[PDB]
Structure 1
């Protein structure tokens, strides 16, 4: 049996080139090498208040975007989190093996709490426990995420180790898979801030489903620096915007930063932004063409969700039965 890959994305906001380079790109590339399981985490999405029609549409948008990126339902398991009850069941059990202080110290809870002061809910606080359940159910070996999820992944490793120390080899201890390029794509007008899929200023983001003409304009207005002469060189501290543009270009083309710096010797930010705009515009045009063919095929989306929940439930039920036996529950008949 192949080692197992698991990862998820929220059907909230609009997925960006950041979500693609930090996660989805690795998801597509891992499908033959490993046994891959990819989840649309609708139960995590509702830790921020959603409109019911927007959430349902966004769940199906996210599924079609996975397929458009090249996630192949003949190679990978693709499913909607709420379709597998074992996620919530194991999540409750793992609350009892997680410390309050491990949750209160989380960067995501602190940032989200500041943004949504009127909805500091228990789900937002308990977010990392459900995510540990998502990973540990599938005997997961590798979790491809961006840098912002590292703290969450480290807690899932601590929970797995703590539970195993008491009860035996119930869980695998998962490892993060974080890319060398594109692990933390930054905002186009505030390159010290991560690119957000829920930004109130749309000019900060490159949306995967945004009009490529709109995206090219945003790239040309991306902030650079006051260097005289202008020089294309990677330096996050002193050249955050130029560095972020180089990181996006490297991630799209596969070229190294040193190769890009050599290609741009004697050139300035017009050549850099021209190449980033051309590469991103081409990628999004091809991606969106595949997207509409999947998004408007409800029979195919329905079949992928049915087959994926059936495959996930088989794995998850096996792990949950072992967890329930270990902690001392009377087994269900």
Structure 2
């Protein structure tokens, strides 16, 4: 049997070109090489308060977007997290093998808490433990994520090793799969802050379902630097904006940074922004064309969810049964 790939994305906010290059692009590319399982993590989404109608719509939007990206339900398992009870069941169990201190030191908890001061909830704090359960349920070998999830992923490894040390080879210890390019795509007007899928200022973001004409305008207004003369060179510390544009271009086109720097020799930020705008506009036009075809076919979305939950449940029930036997529960019959 093939090694197992697992990853997920939240049906909240609006997925960006950051989410694509950091995760979804890798998801699509791994489907033949590994046994891939992709999850719409609606139980994680509700750690930030959602409108009920928006949550339901976003779950289905996210499914259609996976399909539009090239996630193929004949090759990969695609499912909604809340459809498989074993996620919450294992999450509770792993809560008992996770330390309070490990969770309080998490960067996401701190950042989200600062942002949502009036809803610092226990789910937000416990976020990483449910994420560990998501991964460990499927005997996962590889987890394709962006740089921002590295810390959560490291806890999942710690939990698996801790549990295995007491009980035997119950879990696989998963490894991160973080790409070379596009692992941390930055905001267009604040290039020292990563691109957010729920940014208050939409001008920071390239949304995957956003009007391409609007995206082209946003790229043209992206902040660069005061260098005289302007030079197109990758340098995160001194040229955050220009570097972010190069990273985006590289990730869309497949061209390396040295190749792009050569291409832009004797050229300035007009040429750079023109190429980024054209590459991104084309990608989004094609993606959105596929998206609407999937999004408006409710019978197909319903079948994909049904088949995916069924396949996921088979894997998940097996791991949970072994966990419950190990920790000492009376088995259900």
TM range (shorter): over 0.9
* Off by >4 Å, runs of 4+ in structure 1: none
C-alpha distance after superposition, 1:40-84 (max 9, x if no partner): 000000000000000000000000000000000000000000000
Deviation of 1:259 after TM superposition, in Å, equals 0.2
Measured against aligned partners, the alpha-carbon deviations of 1:227-258 in whole angstroms (never above 9, x if no partner) come to: 00000000000000000000000000000000
For residue 199 of structure 1, report the CA deviation from its aligned partner: 0.1
Q: TM-score, normalised by structure 2?
A: 1.00
Shift of 1:264: 0.1
**Which secondary structure does the structure 2 equivalent of 1:114 belong to?**
helix
Once the two structures are TM-superposed, the CA of residue 91 in structure 1 deviates from its matched residue by: 0.1
| Shift in Å, 1:159 | 0.1
Instruction: List per-residue Cα deviations over 1:194-244 (Å, max 9, x = no partner).
Output: 000000000000000000000000000000000000000000000000000
- In the TM superposition, residue 29 of structure 1 has moved relative to its aligned partner by 0.1
Cα shift at 1:34? 0.1
2:111 matched to which residue of 1? 111
SS at match of 2:5: strand
Q: In the aligned structure 2, how far is the partner of 1:330 from the partner of 1:231?
A: 67
Cα distance between partner residues in 1 of 2:232 and 2:90: 49
Task: Describe the SS at the equivalent of 2:27.
Answer: helix
Partner of 1:314: 314
Corresponding residue SS for 2:124: helix
Q: Partner of 2:236 in structure 1?
A: 236
Q: Secondary structure at the match of 1:255?
A: coil
Cα displacement (A) at 1:328? 0.2
Deviation digits for residues 153-197 of structure 1, max 9, x if unmatched? 000000000000000000000000000000000000000000000
User: Runs of 5+ in structure 2 lacking a partner?
Assistant: none
Shift in Å at residue 277 of structure 1? 0.1
- How do residues 117-196 of structure 1 correspond to structure 2 at under 5 angstroms? 117-196=117-196
Q: Which residue of 2 aligns with 1:88?
A: 88
Determine helix, strand or coil for the equivalent of 1:179: coil
Shift of 1:297: 0.1
Q: 1:19-49: per-residue Cα shift (whole Å, max 9, x none)? A: 0000000000000000000000000000000
Q: TM-score, normalised by structure 1?
A: 1.00
Distance in 1 (CA, whole Å) between partners of 2:168 and 2:226 is 59
CA-CA distance at 1:92 after TM superposition: 0.2
How much does 1:99 deviate? 0.1
CA distance in 2, matches of 1:293, 1:243: 35
Q: How far does the alpha carbon of each residue in 1:75-126 deviate from its partner, in whole angstroms, 9 at most, with x for none?
A: 0000000000000000000000000000000000000000000000000000
5+ residue gaps in structure 1?
Answer: none
- Distance (Å, rounded) in 2 between the aligned partners of 1:118 and 1:312: 35
SS across alignment from 2:71? coil
In 1, Cα distance between equivalents of 2:236 and 2:27: 27
1:275-305 CA deviation, whole Å, 9 max, x = no partner? 0000000000000000000000000000000
Give how far 1:313 is off: 0.1
Matched residue SS, 1:38: strand
The whole-number CA distance in structure 2 between the counterparts of 1:90 and 1:225 is 49
- Cα deviations by residue, 1:300-329 (Å, 9 ceiling, x for unpaired): 000000000000000000000000000000
Q: Secondary structure at the match of 2:330?
A: coil
